[PDB]
Amino acid sequence: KNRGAELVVDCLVEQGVTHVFGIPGAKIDAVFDALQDKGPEIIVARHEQNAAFMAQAVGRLTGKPGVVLVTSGPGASNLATGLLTANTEGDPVVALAGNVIRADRLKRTHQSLDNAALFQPITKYSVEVQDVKNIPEAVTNAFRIASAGQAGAAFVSFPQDVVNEVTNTKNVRAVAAPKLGPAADDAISAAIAKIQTAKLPVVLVGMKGGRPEAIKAVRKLLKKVQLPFVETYQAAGTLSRDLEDQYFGRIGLFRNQPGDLLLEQADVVLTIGYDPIEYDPKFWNINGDRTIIHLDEIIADIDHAYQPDLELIGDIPSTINHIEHDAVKVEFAEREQKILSDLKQYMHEGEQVPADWKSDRAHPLEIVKELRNAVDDHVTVTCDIGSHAIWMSRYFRSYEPLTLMISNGMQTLGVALPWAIGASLVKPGEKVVSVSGDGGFLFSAMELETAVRLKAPIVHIVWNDSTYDMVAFQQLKKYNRTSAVDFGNIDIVKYAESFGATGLRVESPDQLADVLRQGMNAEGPVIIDVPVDYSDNINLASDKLPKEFGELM
Amino acid sequence: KNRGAELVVDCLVEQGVTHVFGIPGAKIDAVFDALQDKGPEIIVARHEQNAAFMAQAVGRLTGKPGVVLVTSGPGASNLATGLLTANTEGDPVVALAGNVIRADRLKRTHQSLDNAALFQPITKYSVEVQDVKNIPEAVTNAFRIASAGQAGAAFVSFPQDVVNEVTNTKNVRAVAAPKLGPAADDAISAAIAKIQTAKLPVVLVGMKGGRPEAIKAVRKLLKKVQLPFVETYQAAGTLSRDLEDQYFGRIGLFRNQPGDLLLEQADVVLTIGYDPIEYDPKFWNINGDRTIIHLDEIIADIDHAYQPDLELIGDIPSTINHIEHDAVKVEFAEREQKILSDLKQYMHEGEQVPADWKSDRAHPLEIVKELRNAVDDHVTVTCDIGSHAIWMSRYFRSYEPLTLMISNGMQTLGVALPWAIGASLVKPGEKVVSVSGDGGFLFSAMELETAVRLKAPIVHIVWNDSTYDMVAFQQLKKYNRTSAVDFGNIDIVKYAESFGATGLRVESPDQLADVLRQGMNAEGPVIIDVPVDYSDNINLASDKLPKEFGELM
Amino acid sequence: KNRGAELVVDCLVEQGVTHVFGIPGAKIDAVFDALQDKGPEIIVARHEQNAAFMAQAVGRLTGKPGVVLVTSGPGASNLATGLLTANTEGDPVVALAGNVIRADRLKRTHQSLDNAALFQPITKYSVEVQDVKNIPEAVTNAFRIASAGQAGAAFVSFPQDVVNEVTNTKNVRAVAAPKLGPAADDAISAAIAKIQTAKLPVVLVGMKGGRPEAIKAVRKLLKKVQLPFVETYQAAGTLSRDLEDQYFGRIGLFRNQPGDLLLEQADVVLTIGYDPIEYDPKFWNINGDRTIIHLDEIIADIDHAYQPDLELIGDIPSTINHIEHDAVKVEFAEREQKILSDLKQYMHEGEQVPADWKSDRAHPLEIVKELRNAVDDHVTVTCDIGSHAIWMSRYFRSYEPLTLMISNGMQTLGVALPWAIGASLVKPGEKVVSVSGDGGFLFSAMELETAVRLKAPIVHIVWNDSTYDMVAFQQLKKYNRTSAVDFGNIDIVKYAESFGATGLRVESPDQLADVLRQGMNAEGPVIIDVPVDYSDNINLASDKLPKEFGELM
Numbered sequence A, B, C: 001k002n003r004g005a006e007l008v009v010d011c012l013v014e015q016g017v018t019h020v021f022g023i024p025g026a027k028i029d030a031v032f033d034a035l036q037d038k039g040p041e042i043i044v045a046r047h048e049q050n051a052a053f054m055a056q057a058v059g060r061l062t063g064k065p066g067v068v069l070v071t072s073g074p075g076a077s078n079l080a081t082g083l084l085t086a087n088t089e090g091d092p093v094v095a096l097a098g099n100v101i102r103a104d105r106l107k108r109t110h111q112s113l114d115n116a117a118l119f120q121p122i123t124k125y126s127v128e129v130q131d132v133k134n135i136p137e138a139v140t141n142a143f144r145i146a147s148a149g150q151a152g153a154a155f156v157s158f159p160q161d162v163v164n165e166v167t168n169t170k171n172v173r174a175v176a177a178p179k180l181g182p183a184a185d186d187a188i189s190a191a192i193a194k195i196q197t198a199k200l201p202v203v204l205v206g207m208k209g210g211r212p213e214a215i216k217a218v219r220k221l222l223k224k225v226q227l228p229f230v231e232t233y234q235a236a237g238t239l240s241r242d243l244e245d246q247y248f249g250r251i252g253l254f255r256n257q258p259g260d261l262l263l264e265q266a267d268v269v270l271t272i273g274y275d276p277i278e279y280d281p282k283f284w285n286i287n288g289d290r291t292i293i294h295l296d297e298i299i300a301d302i303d304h305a306y307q308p309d310l311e312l313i314g315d316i317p318s319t320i321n322h323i324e325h326d327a328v329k330v331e332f333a334e335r336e337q338k339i340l341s342d343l344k345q346y347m348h349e350g351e352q353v354p355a356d357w358k359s360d361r362a363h364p365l366e367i368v369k370e371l372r373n374a375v376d377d378h379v380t381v382t383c384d385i386g387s388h389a390i391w392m393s394r395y396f397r398s399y400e401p402l403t404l405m406i407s408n409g410m411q412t413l414g415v416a417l418p419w420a421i422g423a424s425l426v427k428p429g430e431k432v433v434s435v436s437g438d439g440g441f442l443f444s445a446m447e448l449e450t451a452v453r454l455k456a457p458i459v460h461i462v463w464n465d466s467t468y469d470m471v472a473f474q475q476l477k478k479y480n481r482t483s484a485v486d487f488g489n490i491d492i493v494k495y496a497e498s499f500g501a502t503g504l505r506v507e508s509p510d511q512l513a514d515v516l517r518q519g520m521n522a523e524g525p526v527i528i529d530v531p532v533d534y535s536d537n538i539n540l541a542s543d544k545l546p547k548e549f550g551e552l553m
C-alpha cells in the first residue's frame, strides 16, 4: 500500500524475522495491518512484558534480534523491564512502538509521552522517527546495534501519522553487522605465555563465553590445555560430560562456593566474555595479587577489584582458537594437584542432600536431581528468579549451549514461562522446560493462555513454598525477621486446568520422578506443582566452606 | 534503629499514610525491616504494576498520595506504566524505590540503572538521594509535589547504603501543600458577564471537576444558573438525579455524541478542571467561533482548537463558588430550548437497545442497565479499558463523586481489579465493583490472590467476547480487516476458583440480574463471567447522529 | 511567503517582541529571512552566550520573555549557560534554535544533536517541533510557560525542513499567561495575627519581591507596619531613602552581616518571593525557633532549615496589599529597640573604610561610594561576579526597582556588559553602567563591538587587580595557598580603543570621582580601568561581627 507501515514490515522481511510478538492498538495499527499482507507471524501476547520476554528468548537462542511490537503510551511503557532485562543480559531485541501524531506530540493527549527519552537509559539505542523516509534507516541500524557486541536492546518509536503516511521511499539492504577479527597477535602470545608460566591457571567463563561458537572453542582449549574452569550462571552449558573433572561449578550471589576458593588460589585467571554483572569481581578477586587476562568482544570495566593485566579484545571464538592452537598442556605441581582435589571433594559434598535431612517435602537438591534426570541434555530449560533459582543456578548441570537460561543481569521475576514459549517457537518439535517459584509464577502466568493457544510443548515446574523466600532468608540473616514475604497459595493444578492446560501435582516426595516423566510425555502445556522444603536455604549464604578450607590451608 | 530507613518510615507516619503497596527485595530491604517496627500496614502485591495501580486508586479516592515501595532494577522498572498512568490522570502517587550502593552506581552490577533518569519523563518529580541527611527533605517535597495541582506522580530512589546508614538526622515537619485562593475577582466578573449574555452557555466538566469538593461546587452552579452540562469520563459522578434534565452525557473517544452537538451549538463554554487528554478540543471545539472560559488550578495549554478568551486560574471549588454567588439563572429563547429539547430526545434514543435486536447473549446496554440497577449509589465501580469501557463510560450513570473510576489519560489495560482492591482498603466494609473485558482481565488478574488474602468484597464483571474488540472494530472501520485481536477463552469460573475466590457465570441473558445480585451478596472476591454480543460495537464510532442532527439544523 | 518560518515570526509579532538577539546559520536561515519582511529588529551578537545574557536582561527588565535565535549544533549548545542562568534567576527567556532536517535527525551529520534533551535539565520547557502545523502552539506555550511563576527559560528547536515548509497553517492568538489571585483570606489573616503578636517581626525581601510591582507593594507594607527588612541581592531596589532606618542591608554569601543577626533575633520572618538559591536558609534560619511565613507565587521547598508555619501562595503584590490593608503599625518594646539600634551601628561601621587604611590604590568602598555619587537613581547598573560583586552587592545602595542587576542564582561570569547592552535597548536614551572584575570582563568583552555598533551609552567599570580574587581569598581561608587565580594584565584603555570605544584610566585614587564622571559624560561605549587594593577582601568572610554581637548579647 506504500505506507510507512509497509517499510517497517519490509525491514522485518529483509531481516529474516519469523515471529513478531505483540499487542495491537490504535497508534500502531497500520503496522499490524501491513502484517496481514506479508511478513513474520504475529504472536499475540497477553501482556507486553511477556512479549518482551519472548523476544528476549528468541534473541538469546538465535543470535538474531527478537522482535516486539506495541502501541503507544502504556503499550510502550509496559516494555520497560523486558527491554532493560535484555539490555543487561546480552540478548539482542528490537522493540517497535507507536506514538501520537507528530502534530500533537507535545500535547496532553491520549497515550502520549516521550517514548525515546523513557528508553534512553535502558537500551543501547532509543530513537523516534520523525520523517517516513527515515524508517528503513532507523530500523536497519536498530537491528545492527542490537546485535553488535555486546548485544542488547534497541527501541524505535513511530508517530501514528508517520506509519500511515503514503511514500515512494525505498527499503535499504539488511546489511548484517560484521564480526570483529581475533585479538591482536602480540596479546594472544602474551596470554599463552601467562598461562604456561602459571602455577595454577584457571578459566572463568562468563556471559559471552556461553554462546554456542564460544563454548565449542572454549571446550577445545580446556581439553588441550587441561585448565580447571568455572561458569557464571549465563555460561551454563559450557561444561561437557568430558570436562566434569576440570569443572569447579557455578560462581555467583554469595562468595562461598568451591569456584570462589579455586579462583582465590589461582595466580592467573583467564576470563571469557565476562560481564561482571553476573558476579561482581569484588567478591572473587580478593585475598590478593593474581593475573587477570580479560578476553571479550568489548573492553573491560575497570574496578577496584578488576584491573586486567592483559586485554584480548576481538571476536571471542576466533581469539580462543588462536590461544588453543599454540598453547600446550599445563602440568600441575603436587601442591596445586592437592588443592584441586580437595576443592573437587568439597564440591561433591556441596551437591548432596544433608545426612540429617528428613521432611514431608522434597529437598531442593532432590528436585534438581530428579529434574535433571527426567530431561534430555538437548532440551532447553528456562529458570525464573528466587531461592529455587539459586539451587538451579548452582546444581542443575547443563551440557549443551543455551539449554539452561537464567536472568542473571536484572534477576527479573516472571521470565521463565514466557522464555519457554519463545524457546518452543525457536525449537519446533522439542519439549521446553520452565522452572519458577510460586511468587515469580504469577508475574507472567497469564501467558499460559498463549502457550495453550499455540499448543506449545512446555512443562512448567513450580517450586511451591508460599513465600518470597529469596528475600526472606536474606532478611533473617540481616534483621532476624521477615517483612512482606507471605502470600496465600492458589490451586496450581486448577489454575492450569482453567486455561485448558494440563495440571499435575507431586503429592508426596517419592512421586517426583514419575510425575516429572508424566509431564515430559503429556500433550500440550503442563504445569507441575512441586511442594518444597526451604528450611535448608539459609545455608546457601553460609560461610562454612570458606572457613573450613581456610583452616585446612 | 536510626537508619535512613527509619527516616523514610517517619515521613510516612507524618504524612498519615496507612497503607504501603509493595514488593520487597535486597536493595530496599531496610525500609521493609523498619516498617516492622512502625508505620503504615504493608500490602504485598503480586506485581509492582498492580502495586502502582493500587496506590493510584488510593490517591484518586483520598486526595493523599498513594504509596508504593519497590526494590532496585526490575522492581523499579515495573513501576513505569503505573506511574505514567497516575501522572497523566491527575492522581497523587509517591513511589519509593531501592538502588545499588552509591560506590557501585556506575557499574554493570545486579539490578543497577539510572532510576531517576528512567522516571524523569513520566513523573512530576524524579530524584535519587545521595546523602542520608537529605532523606526527609526529598520525601516531604515528593509528597507536596505529588499533591499540588495538577496532581501526579513523584519518584524517589534510595541507594542501599543510604537507607542502611546510621544517622542522627532529624525528621522535618510534614508541611502540607497549601491550597490556592480563587481566581482573580475581575476575571470572575468578566466570566459571569459573558455567561449572562450568552444565547447558550454550557458547562464542560472535566478531570479536576471530578473531585468531591469540585463536584459539590459545580452542582450548586448548575442548579442556580440552570446550565446544560457535559462530563468527561473522569468527571463521572458530577450528575445527580435532579440534574438529569440539564445533562447531555459523557463526551470522549469519537465525535458522535449529543454532548458534542451541544458543545457545537454553544456560543459560550465554561470548562472546569479540563485536562484535554480526556478528549482533545480539536474534536468538539469546531464549526464556529465560540467563547471559551477556562477554569482550572493550572494555566491552559494553547491549542489550534483551544484559545481561551478568559482564564480563571486558582483553587477550583472556591472559584466556582464566586461565580455561583453572583451569577443568576439563564433564560433560554425558544430557538435554543428546541435545540436542547431535540438533543435530549436524541440522547434518550442512543441509550436504548435497538428494536430489531435479538441475540443468545446480552446486549452491552442490558449489562450496563442491569449492573446499575443492582448497585447502590454509594458503591465504587472501577472500569478497565476496551469496548466494554466505552459502553460503561457513555451509559453507566454515576451519582456520587469517585464511584465510577475510568483510566482516561493513558487508557491502561488491567487497572480495574487492582483499583477495586485499593478502593476496598479505602472503604472497608463496602462492596467494590470492577468491570473489564476478557483481554484486560489477564493483564492484572494475578492480583486476585491479594484480594482473596485480604478477604476483599470485590465483585469483578468480565465481558466475554474472546477478542481485543476495541482495536478490532476500529481496524475494520479503517482497513476492513482485523489484525492480532484473537486469543483463546479461559474458564473464568474455574480461574476464580483456583484462587479460592467465587466464580459465577451468566449462562443465559435472562439470568443477568440474578447472577449480579448473587455476586453482590457473596462473601470474599467474586468473578462473574458475562457473555456479550458485540455486533453493535461498530456503531460506537458511527457518524449517523451528527449527520441526522445536521439535516435537522 | 507562508513557510513555518513565517509562523515563527507571526508569533513574535503577536507577543509584542521588539528585539531578537541572535546569530544566523544555515539551519535557522528561513526564520532570519522571514524577519527581513516583518517582526522585531535583529540584534546580531558576537557570541550566542551573550545573545542569551542580553535576552535574559530583557526578560528581567520587562517581564516579557527576552528572545534569542540561533542555529543548530554549536549555535544551540552555546546557549546552555545563558539559559541555565536565566532559568535559575527568575528571568523569562524564549530560545529558538535550528536543527537538522527531520529525515537526518538520527544521523552523524553536521550540527545535529538531541537539542531538546540537552536543554531539558536547564529549562522549564524544552521541545522540538516535528510538524509545521504545531509551530504556533509550541511557541505560544513557550512564551506562557517562560512567563508563568516562577519565570524561567523555555527552549524550542526547529528542524530546518519544518521552518522551510510551505503551509496553510493558521497562527494562534497570543493568549497572555493570566495573573493568579492573592493567597487565600484565611492564610492572610493568620499571617497578620502572627505578625502583630511578634516581639520582633522582620521582612526578608527575595528574588520575586524585586519586581517593580512587588517592591511597590512591599514599600507600603514596610512603611505602614514599620517592619525592619533585608534584601537578597536580586531584591536590590526595594530600598527608598525613607526606609533606610528600617533597612538592615543585603544578606548573602557569608553569614556575617547585620541582616543575619537581625534574622536570628527575629521571632517571626515574612519571606517575600524568596528563592533560597540566593542564600540557603541553613545560613540564616539557625540558633532558635522562629516563625516562617512563606509568601510566594509558588509553593516553598521544604528544607531542614526551612519549614514554613504558613504558606501564602498566590500573586505576590495582591497578597502583600491584603496584608498591608489590615495590618497596623508594630510597636517595639525597649529590648528590641536596643537590638535594632545596636545592629544599625554595626551596620554603619561596616560601611566605612578602616581608619588605618593607606594605599596607592582605591579601597573597594571608595569605588562603591564614588560610583553611587556619580550615578543618578534611575540609571541601571549591572554587575558581574567576583570580589568586586561582593562589595557592590553589599554596599551599593539602589533606590529604584531594576537598577542594580546581579547574577545571584548561577553567579555567572561575564554577564555585566551584555546585560548593560540589553538594558540600553530596553531604555533607549539612558546611560547604563556595567561593573566587573578583570577576570569576568574577558568572558564577554567581545560584545563591546555590539555596543559600539549600536552606539549604546554604556559605561563599563573594570575593577583591576590581576586575579580571580573571589576564588583566591577563599582558597587562602581553606588551604592557605592559591591555585590558578593568576593571569597577565591587558591594556584596558587600548582594548577599548581597538573596538572604537573610549577607554579611561584612574591613574591615582584621587581622580576616581572625575574619571567616572568623565565616563558618564562621554559619547558611545566607555571602559574605565580602575586599579583596586584587595588586601581587605578576606574580611568579607570574617566572623568578627557575629562574635562581637554574641558577646554583647
Ligand SMILES: Cc1ncc(C[n+]2csc(CCOP(=O)(O)OP(=O)(O)O)c2C)c(N)n1
Pocket: A384, A385, A386, A387, A388, A389, A410, A411, A412, A413, A436, A437, A438, A439, A440, A441, A463, A465, A467, A468, A469, A470, A471, B023, B024, B025, B026, B071, B074, B075, B078
Ligand atoms: C520484578 C522483581 N521484583 C522483586 C524482585 C526481588 N526478589 C528477588 S527473589 C523474590 C521472590 C521470589 O519468590 P519465588 O518466585 O516464590 O521463588 P522462591 O524464592 O520462593 O523459590 C523477589 C521478590 C525481583 N527479583 N524482581
Ligand SMILES: Cc1ncc(C[n+]2csc(CCOP(=O)(O)OP(=O)(O)O)c2C)c(N)n1
Pocket: A023, A024, A025, A026, A071, A074, A075, A078, B385, B386, B387, B388, B389, B410, B411, B412, B413, B436, B437, B438, B439, B440, B441, B463, B465, B467, B468, B469, B470, B471
Ligand atoms: C497496556 C495496553 N496495551 C494495549 C492497549 C490498546 N487496547 C485498547 S482496548 C484493547 C483491547 C481490550 O480488549 P478487552 O479487554 O477484551 O475488552 P473488550 O474491548 O473486548 O470489551 C487494547 C489492546 C492499551 N490501551 N493498553
Ligand SMILES: Cc1ncc(C[n+]2csc(CCOP(=O)(O)OP(=O)(O)O)c2C)c(N)n1
Pocket: C384, C385, C386, C387, C388, C389, C410, C411, C412, C413, C436, C437, C438, C439, C440, C441, C463, C465, C467, C468, C469, C470, C471
Ligand atoms: C563561568 C564561571 N566560571 C568560574 C566561576 C568561579 N568564580 C567565581 S568569582 C571568580 C573570580 C572572577 O574574577 P574577577 O572577575 O576578576 O573578579 P574579582 O574577584 O577579581 O573582583 C570566579 C572565577 C564562575 N562564578 N563562573
Ligand SMILES: [Mg+2]
Pocket: A386, A437, A438, A439, A463, A464, A465, A466, A467, A468, A469
Ligand atoms: Mg516461593
Ligand SMILES: [Mg+2]
Pocket: B437, B438, B439, B463, B464, B465, B466, B467, B468, B469
Ligand atoms: Mg474482549
Ligand SMILES: [Mg+2]
Pocket: C386, C437, C438, C439, C463, C464, C465, C466, C467, C468, C469
Ligand atoms: Mg580580577
